[PDB]
Design a protein around this motif. Structure first.
Motif, PDB file in Angstrom:
ATOM      1  N   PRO A 237       2.648 -18.630  24.384  1.00  0.00           N
ATOM      2  CA  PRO A 237       2.190 -18.905  22.746  1.00  0.00           C
ATOM      3  C   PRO A 237       0.774 -19.179  22.651  1.00  0.00           C
ATOM      4  O   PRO A 237       0.318 -20.080  23.444  1.00  0.00           O
ATOM      5  CB  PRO A 237       3.305 -19.825  22.341  1.00  0.00           C
ATOM      6  CG  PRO A 237       3.428 -20.794  23.652  1.00  0.00           C
ATOM      7  CD  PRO A 237       3.449 -19.436  24.445  1.00  0.00           C
ATOM      8  N   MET A 238       0.026 -18.651  21.602  1.00  0.00           N
ATOM      9  CA  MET A 238      -1.179 -19.114  21.461  1.00  0.00           C
ATOM     10  C   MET A 238      -1.802 -18.459  20.045  1.00  0.00           C
ATOM     11  O   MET A 238      -0.955 -17.947  19.313  1.00  0.00           O
ATOM     12  CB  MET A 238      -2.134 -18.172  22.479  1.00  0.00           C
ATOM     13  CG  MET A 238      -2.279 -16.867  22.437  1.00  0.00           C
ATOM     14  SD  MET A 238      -3.161 -16.245  23.955  1.00  0.00           S
ATOM     15  CE  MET A 238      -2.034 -16.110  25.012  1.00  0.00           C
ATOM     16  N   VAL A 239      -2.893 -19.070  19.588  1.00  0.00           N
ATOM     17  CA  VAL A 239      -3.666 -18.558  18.542  1.00  0.00           C
ATOM     18  C   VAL A 239      -4.834 -17.825  18.507  1.00  0.00           C
ATOM     19  O   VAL A 239      -5.626 -18.255  19.534  1.00  0.00           O
ATOM     20  CB  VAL A 239      -3.535 -19.629  17.272  1.00  0.00           C
ATOM     21  CG1 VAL A 239      -4.547 -20.832  17.845  1.00  0.00           C
ATOM     22  CG2 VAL A 239      -3.570 -19.219  16.062  1.00  0.00           C
ATOM     23  N   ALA A 240      -5.041 -16.997  18.035  1.00  0.00           N
ATOM     24  CA  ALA A 240      -6.665 -16.152  17.618  1.00  0.00           C
ATOM     25  C   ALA A 240      -6.758 -16.078  16.180  1.00  0.00           C
ATOM     26  O   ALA A 240      -6.057 -16.780  15.390  1.00  0.00           O
ATOM     27  CB  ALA A 240      -6.348 -14.544  18.084  1.00  0.00           C
ATOM     28  N   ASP A 241      -7.881 -15.541  15.895  1.00  0.00           N
ATOM     29  CA  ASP A 241      -8.364 -15.677  14.594  1.00  0.00           C
ATOM     30  C   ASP A 241      -7.763 -15.182  13.394  1.00  0.00           C
ATOM     31  O   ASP A 241      -7.716 -15.405  12.198  1.00  0.00           O
ATOM     32  CB  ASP A 241      -9.928 -15.283  14.613  1.00  0.00           C
ATOM     33  CG  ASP A 241     -10.097 -13.729  14.714  1.00  0.00           C
ATOM     34  OD1 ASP A 241      -9.221 -13.056  15.248  1.00  0.00           O
ATOM     35  OD2 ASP A 241     -11.216 -13.246  14.129  1.00  0.00           O
ATOM     36  N   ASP A 242      -6.844 -14.267  13.925  1.00  0.00           N
ATOM     37  CA  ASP A 242      -5.726 -13.616  12.798  1.00  0.00           C
ATOM     38  C   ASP A 242      -4.527 -14.051  12.915  1.00  0.00           C
ATOM     39  O   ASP A 242      -3.434 -13.383  12.578  1.00  0.00           O
ATOM     40  CB  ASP A 242      -5.903 -11.910  12.984  1.00  0.00           C
ATOM     41  CG  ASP A 242      -5.555 -11.560  14.612  1.00  0.00           C
ATOM     42  OD1 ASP A 242      -5.343 -12.127  15.611  1.00  0.00           O
ATOM     43  OD2 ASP A 242      -5.490 -10.288  14.493  1.00  0.00           O
ATOM     44  N   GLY A 243      -4.268 -15.035  13.848  1.00  0.00           N
ATOM     45  CA  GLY A 243      -2.895 -15.868  13.614  1.00  0.00           C
ATOM     46  C   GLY A 243      -2.480 -15.976  15.066  1.00  0.00           C
ATOM     47  O   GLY A 243      -2.735 -15.515  16.203  1.00  0.00           O
TER      48      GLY A 243
END
Ligand SMILES: [Cl-]
Ligand SMILES: [Cl-]
Ligand SMILES: [Cu+]
Ligand SMILES: [Cu+]
Ligand SMILES: [Fe+2]
Lengths: 157, 159
Positions: free
Chosen positions: B87-93
């Motif tokens: 699990p991780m986050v990028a600029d689009d979620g």
């Protein structure tokens, strides 16, 4: 129905509100205090604000947070601490804990004036990652912080 | 961009389950996934609640605390590799992802070609995420572990 705890705070890309309701029953068993032992279920309601700096869409639940609480009865001086657990209810995911108030065998956690504090650490503490490349990257996470509320506990709802 | 779609999304167990890939991405904290310079793609599972989700998730919400294993098979060459998407986050979620060596992996035949991708998905309780079950606030039972598969043609890193 849920009773509001103080006023919500906006910080670190998040809306952070607190509520309590009647005790709930959680699975898996043996983690959350059993409903018959509790007087309330405490919830932290934490969602992304607009333009969240870590890439969470507005309104999304903020996952993988490490959250502890401290509950102080300011009339009796009684203090207790615990951790809120991630879980889902009919109204979606939150961080929650059943809590003994009147039923706390230590005493001092009955009807009265309270201070509640959440102590919150970022998702990386649990190994959640973030993109950092130019194309899709997001900014750094907040350092651990606390937020405080004041409320009147009027009894097990 | 954006992401290269892998096969067709599935709608199963109250969720949309899609697969996509991008160029390798630099992730923090350092050391917990394969370095970008060592990889050829970033593979993602794109998983969100459908309407009327039976486990209490509102429509569109990211499904968190899933355990997601992948198997990537080159059906031309026979090459197989397995791993976990984190699990991780990028600029689009938020999403589940991993950097993967394809051409750069000299230990197998992971070049341009025809692929089968399988996700093996377990529910959030496996990681101790809870669910209310009282009458007043409770939700439905979790899905049992399941697999979804996709076919795609890998054509190289997006460039
Ligand atoms: Cl307050
Ligand atoms: Cl497919
Ligand atoms: Cu709860
Ligand atoms: Cu990723
Ligand atoms: Fe709630």
């Amino acid at each position: 129905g849920e009773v509001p705890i103080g006023d919500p705070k906006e910080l670190n890309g998040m809306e952070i509100a607190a509520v309590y309701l009647q005790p709930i029953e959680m699975e898996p068993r043996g983690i959350d205090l059993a409903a018959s032992l509790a007087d309330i279920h405490l919830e932290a309601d934490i969602h992304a604000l607009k333009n969240n700096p870590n890439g969470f869409p507005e309104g999304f639940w903020m996952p993988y947070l490490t959250i502890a609480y401290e509950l102080k009865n300011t009339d009796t001086g009684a203090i207790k601490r615990g951790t809120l657990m991630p879980m889902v209810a009919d109204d979606g995911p939150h961080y929650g804990a059943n809590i003994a108030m009147e039923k706390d065998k230590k005493g001092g956690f009955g009807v009265g004036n309270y201070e509640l504090t959440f102590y919150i650490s970022n998702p990386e503490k649990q190994g959640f990652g973030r993109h950092v490349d130019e194309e899709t990257g997001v900014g750094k996470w907040f350092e651990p912080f606390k937020v405080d509320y004041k409320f009147k506990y009027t009894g097990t709802p």
